[PDB]
Design a protein around this ligand. Structure first.
Ligand SMILES: [Zn+2]
Lengths: 397, 147, 397, 397, 397, 133
């Protein structure tokens, strides 16, 4: 894995640094590493592919060393360099597509393809170069069991869970009470509704609560906390819990009284925020507890007093919402987010070559089913395949 | 070119230039090495008699324009760990040869023309078989013929 | 173009690496490239500007070489380096503003300014340095006709198109049926509405369909697909098709039954998703086909059954929506997105100096009119001017 | 500050470049800088911490130099390098946590901790290395008073301000007129409403206006301008200005007639946009002026004409909205945004060690109260602490 | 690809130039290239075929050089030359059939067969010879991104689209108005018909219009423009738009009044022709706009006045046609035409060996479906396979 | 007219025959004609265009000869050849567009542009090559 990143880093630098007319002192330390790579890789044969429609390709390396001495690199040197680089780039492309496609339940952090099991010897250890990308740094730090952090912009930590809860209900569905939520991507939109608007609740206050457990512990998260959840604020008809009948929801929106957002780690309150909106911070957490309440307004104009009678027919239903959007967060495990394209590369390779469903990953690489049951073996497989996807995304655009 | 020296292993059918060019990427020395790897005689009957002929690059002496291009590439070549007096001596010894461009283009035109005009008077076959005893050539005589 | 990136890369590195007190071995390979640059650029004169209010500046280069004899760089060397760097940075700033401002219908990928046509000689080819940024890498790969990819975060692939379609309509506008949509930036919000709620449709099911053709082929796109389009879910009055009269739209929201999202490339179904929300992936596509349908709920509580009569007056109109947001995508052509500022730099240079409207780009650099008719000559001009904008964004902050 | 970035850059590179089996010419220029660092740092003692619960640690440096005699780096060299690197990484971690925690009203741009005041000598100036990150580049450019630019993706330039304005009001609250807005993060959502729908306004047109002053001058901003503000488009009950009574808001949405978005710098109109939506650009501005107007529709179908009577009871209130979202912008001062995590690191260090509220920063590091009153001393403190946070985010993941 | 053309050019010349009795000076420069080819190709083994029913053949090259010692080439030299040429011709035939049969969605311009990927090394670069054919010239010019042009005689730029449009229609189908067209090959035949013969149109003039967008930009096209489209000038019965019923069309032909043929490039009028028939020229265009109109004749003999009553029963329907035939055109992309047989060779190879339908090309190599959706990846695949077809058409007759 | 066809035939052949890696004996008779062309065209200045919107371009030829000392043509020789060929191709393109645009009632078979009237001398007659089209 280290030598695969090293091959790709030298091929990227040798497409970048070895150009026409450049001075030799700019590339004097890269040509020695590329010659060490050629010297190491000669005499060895590899075999990539063999699963799904990924074709079996045989790789044989017989190349001459870049020892001509130039002061400014002329176009002859650039053309022979482009030939050797194009062959090695095709090789590492097929090794990366052979490694992202395989998985194992037993020990997923180990290389699974034959080519990367062959590259994991000490004969190939002199290929090794700097490990400067974030994924290979976290690979090398977790290979020695130290703390890592992946910085994500809007991480997909929440599985898709659009549902509700009726704390007070009946088959008439004309006096309901409870919460509704949308957990999607990095965004929680929650809305507790009461049809009576707390006309018989004690002190005209109805307490709502919504507890979101996470799968991995997020660290140093900037979170936009806004009131008035926008999706649960227009009238809609909703199927029941058993899916038998449908019930109508005509909301009018009160502001959330007494918002308490708590960030729990192992049941301990790490951060708490009482009636503070805008951008908040949560330094260390794996559970988000939103505790908002609906208070009946004690003074109402005649346009408002016709909405909430004391009797039964409520044509306008009180609804109170919050919105919580994790903008950026540092997570020790791998995830998906709106910035990288690594999950897209993994799914593109697994869908392009018509790959059968294996033992670990969900069918079709369903990220909702992958983050719903995010086991440590699936975590190891996901980190390995994302690291190889980062390597191929360095070489192949 | 900074490369480690080869161990030959006699049992292979590959000559040292023939391994060397697959191990050397220059486009100037490699032209010369690939010439010498496959210059050999070409068997054709002319008026009945078989004849061993050069190619036309030796025949008009144009191949020396590539050897001297491959030799003065070895002259602007800094060697990575050779002592500098032996390195300057071997570079100037290459430059002794690489400055006789035309004087040796014309010499291998003349040598090939004498071989032409005397090959016409051959009346038996020109069969190439590795003979038992060999006529010993001194390379000192070749340096004399060059310079 | 390669030598302009090389000038800017050396000036960026020489502002970074040549500092006070640093060791000479840290900068020993940069000073040789900067001296090669000084040796190449001496004796040459340039002329920048001359269009709009961009002033004509004459450039003459007569500089001495930098010293190669220090062990730690003292402040004398730093001050003379800062002088030479500030002159070259002003030169390359005016060359980049002279190149982003010009365009050509005939061959836009060629340099248009006099200074960059003069820099495109082989006399200046020894300036050349590493080409490591994404735009100059894709420039060098498309100069040899190989595959490229620009990675965008929320790409502006959709032109602004807010409109609707009435599959069933009359001048009374009290029983309507059809779709509405908002295509903006990277976001499609579509909503099919029926006023009858499929009370006379066969099997109480009304099929909607919305086909969005793209202008360039996106590759490996992560897409957030949510139901219940939020913008078309509140009551509004809307002008008609001819703009004569206005009609009222009072929506109640059903959930989308039988969502089928298809990603078409050349009419072939590449990816398909049947009733799956959350984050989806689309590996290769240039057409997005959303096929959702409205099903009348067969079981309704008395709060719902008063909304949808069998007769004509429908005060509550059934509406079903979807939202499709491309979070990140790899596109072979250049675009604009929410991450880079290159389009902003191009428009700032073209608006600061009061530049007349030329033959290629839209008046005022309208990105909606630029991506509506995204011709290959306009594509070449846009890629060239974005590459020069990336170069100037390296030098000028 | 320069030497602290230099320590962290060498430790990052020496974790990256010094690996097992790599060629010596790849690391031949890094080992000399790391040996210069060891030679400079020996014989010196430091003391970090001492505020809040940050513990006092004493640092003593007595290390041998690294070997310069290998061809390929073996595992002995890697293990002794990992020891020296882990000690220096712990040192620079505690220096960065000692510097981010302190502040000063007098001159905040100066180092405040004892360790960084000791590192600011010329004895430690030979530690210095390349300054290539964006924050240390802008640090070095503002240390010489030149122009800088921080590129932000969705900058938090707006403080949280959710409020309204009643241009026409009475204690009955049945015929109201005025604007409502949400300024949050990078997003302005504004909506002017009239209950009469301009039935007595001249020419049936009511002019709205919303002026947002900024705190720092943004430059080259890409801005998504959409109509129909989504948050102020559903019915809600809202407390009054004095908080005494509540009033009801039942909106129906007209489209915004005659949108004029102006970008003011020092009262001068830099950019203006008349009825153009989608992505717009604003090259230089510190005030955003939105001027939209509500026009009563002169032709209405019978479904619309029942909504707006000439008399007093308006059960459906005309409402017109806009949405303005700054996607990316270049600002000369430091800010927070959705891309970086530097504010999260600063708040995590200040909240982890239970730090008392000082003279400059708001209690609890409230970003709304920090950008509401964004003084230049607070700007200097924020830039210094963000630069140190960027340094620690390079070393500590 | 260059070396494959070089192999085929030398084998073609060595079948042509190396004949019995010819002088040696006529072939003295060809025998050296053929000997360089033998010297390069010895010691190498190849493997062709393996897809569909194309059989796997293994190729081993062990040949002696040809003699350079004759004055007139005798029959011995011709027979040994014919042996070596027949083996190399069989080799290059199977390499070309192995390359035309394969395709790739990712980068189609790259070689796909194993033999041509092996020939793309610099070991085989000394095979290279002159590149004089049009397809290899345009291959080498587009490999450096310069302008190319393929000269076609009657290019198949139009997909087969025989349809119509009813601007005025009813279920009786006795008073119709609109256009009909046939787009086929290089020929547009359009005919606008009115059943009333503009008896109620303003000024007795009915305006027709027909806009044909192209897929690729044609350049310097000679176009035969004739009036009176011959196919839509006899009576026929035609199915309706939904295919339910059929309607009758009994045309009498008026001449086209006020013909305006415009050649649009990016919406700009490049060439225009007002009432000019015969051969016209269109220098640069990708859209053809035909604007002809039907004028009722104001003076009619009694044989004509019985055809067009003022009342409803029209047994004779006015019809006005145009014909536009592109005789020859220069196109930058590859196409098919009536001169070359390259598409026929590609389809013959793909149909002879029973090849499965891949990801790029249409099933059965449908040229109508290939030019209907003519994507750039399909363009690259089509150009590569047409170049290989041109190479094989040089060798194999 | 003969020398204009000769310029274009040599530039076409030198785009075709002078490629990377080709043997020198394949191009040994073309490089001599291209060097004769360079030797003839040096020291001369031309002026093309000047009618309609065809822009006036001034042409100055100062080129070095191509090398005659390779066995297989390497990429250095190909790149310097591509430079000289691209300049001459731009020259002959503008001469041809300057000649197709002009006409004369008196004697139309004579050259009308200034550049082709200058090329019709015997100084430029050694440019001449095969006339096979
Ligand atoms: Zn984002």
């Amino acid at each position: 894995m280290d030598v695969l990143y090293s091959l790709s880093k030298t091929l990227k630098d040798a497409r970048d640094k070895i150009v026409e007319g450049t001075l030799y002192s700019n590339v004097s330390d890269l040509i020695q590493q590329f010659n060490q790579m050629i010297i190491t890789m000669n005499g060895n044969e590899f075999q990539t592919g063999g699963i799904g429609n990924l074709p079996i390709r045989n790789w044989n390396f017989n190349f001459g060393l870049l020892g001509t001495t130039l002061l400014n690199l002329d176009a002859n040197y650039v053309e022979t360099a482009r030939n050797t680089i194009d062959y090695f780039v095709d090789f590492v492309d097929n090794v990366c597509m052979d490694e992202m496609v395989r998985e194992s339940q037993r020990n997923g952090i180990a290389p699974q393809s034959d080519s990367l099991r062959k590259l994991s010897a000490i004969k190939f250890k002199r290929i090794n170069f700097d490990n400067s990308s974030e994924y290979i740094e976290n690979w090398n730090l977790q290979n020695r069991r130290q703390r890592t952090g992946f910085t994500f912009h809007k991480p997909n930590i929440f599985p898709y869970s659009a549902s509700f809860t009726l704390n007070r209900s009946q088959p008439a569905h004309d006096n309901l009470m409870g919460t509704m939520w949308l957990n999607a991507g990095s965004e929680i939109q929650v809305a507790g509704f009461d049809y009576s608007c707390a006309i018989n609740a004690p002190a005209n206050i109805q307490q709502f609560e919504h507890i979101v457990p996470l799968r991995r512990v997020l660290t140093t998260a900037t979170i936009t906390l806004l009131p008035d959840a926008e999706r649960f604020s227009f009238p809609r008809v909703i199927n029941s819990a058993d899916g038998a009948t449908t019930w109508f929801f005509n909301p009018v929106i009160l502001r959330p009284n007494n918002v308490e957002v708590e960030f729990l780690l192992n049941g301990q309150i790490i951060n708490t925020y009482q009636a503070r909106f805008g951008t908040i911070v949560a330094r260390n957490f794996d559970t988000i507890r939103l505790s908002f309440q609906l208070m009946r307004p004690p003074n109402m104009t005649p346009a408002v007093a016709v909405l909430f009678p004391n009797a039964q027919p409520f044509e306008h239903h009180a609804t109170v919402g919050l919105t919580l959007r994790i903008e950026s967060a540092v997570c020790e495990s791998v995830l998906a987010d709106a910035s990288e394209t690594l999950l897209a590369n993994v799914t593109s390779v697994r869908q392009e070559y018509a790959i059968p469903v294996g033992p670990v990953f969900p069918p079709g690489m369903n990220w909702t089913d992958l983050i719903t049951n995010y086991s440590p073996s699936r975590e190891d497989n996901l980190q390995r395949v994302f690291t190889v996807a980062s390597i191929r995304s360095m070489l192949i655009k | 070119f900074g490369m480690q020296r080869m161990h030959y292993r006699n049992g292979d059918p590959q000559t040292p230039f023939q391994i060397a060019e697959q191990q050397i990427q220059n486009f100037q020395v490699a032209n010369w090495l690939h010439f010498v790897n496959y210059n050999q005689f070409r068997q054709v009957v002319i008026d009945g008699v078989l004849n061993q002929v050069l190619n036309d690059n030796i025949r008009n002496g144009h191949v020396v324009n590539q050897l001297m291009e491959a030799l003065m590439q070895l002259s602007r070549q800094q060697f990575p760990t050779m002592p500098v007096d032996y390195k300057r001596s071997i570079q100037r010894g290459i430059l002794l040869l690489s400055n006789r461009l035309g004087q040796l283009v014309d010499l291998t035109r003349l040598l090939s023309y004498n071989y032409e005009t005397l090959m016409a008077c051959i009346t038996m076959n020109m069969q190439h078989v590795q003979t038992l005893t060999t006529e010993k050539l001194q390379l000192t005589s070749v340096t004399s013929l060059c310079m």
